[PDB]
Amino acid sequence: MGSKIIVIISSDDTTLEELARKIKDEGLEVYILLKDKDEKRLEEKIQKLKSQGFEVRKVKDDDDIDKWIDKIKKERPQLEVRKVTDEDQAKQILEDLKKKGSLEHHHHHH
């Protein structure tokens, strides 16, 4: 219980967005922000995950990702909008949802 959404930023590898299925399984929604080297292979990936049931949006980079999340918070002041740029963070949110709240901080550095 507790309306929350996670935003997972896919970065070449697929482990980030497969974990997204396990996150939304806990009874919340996910949004994927796709970033790839080639915007054509990027665009197909968006459609692959939207077929699986992941609302994927095309962004520039982490600057625009930060603004994108700020936008979603302003539309939807009912829920947490979490940034997951690394796979480590996709495994952190696994524990986040079992705790049904948070660990320490609503942001990341490494």
Domain boundaries, the chain: 1-110
Let me know: does 110 contact 88? Beta carbons within 8 Å. yes
> How was it solved?
NMR
Three-state SS at 55: strand
Let me know: does 58 contact 64? Beta carbons within 8 Å. no
CB-count exposure of residue 78 (10 Å: 0-12, 13-18, 19+): exposed
Let me know: does 5 contact 81? Beta carbons within 8 Å. yes
Q: CA distances (Å), 11 to each of 32, 70, 97, in order?
A: 11, 20, 22
Let me know: does 33 contact 108? Beta carbons within 8 Å. no
Let me know: does 54 contact 20? Beta carbons within 8 Å. yes
In sequence order, the 6+-apart residues with CB closer than 8 A to the CB of 78 are: 3
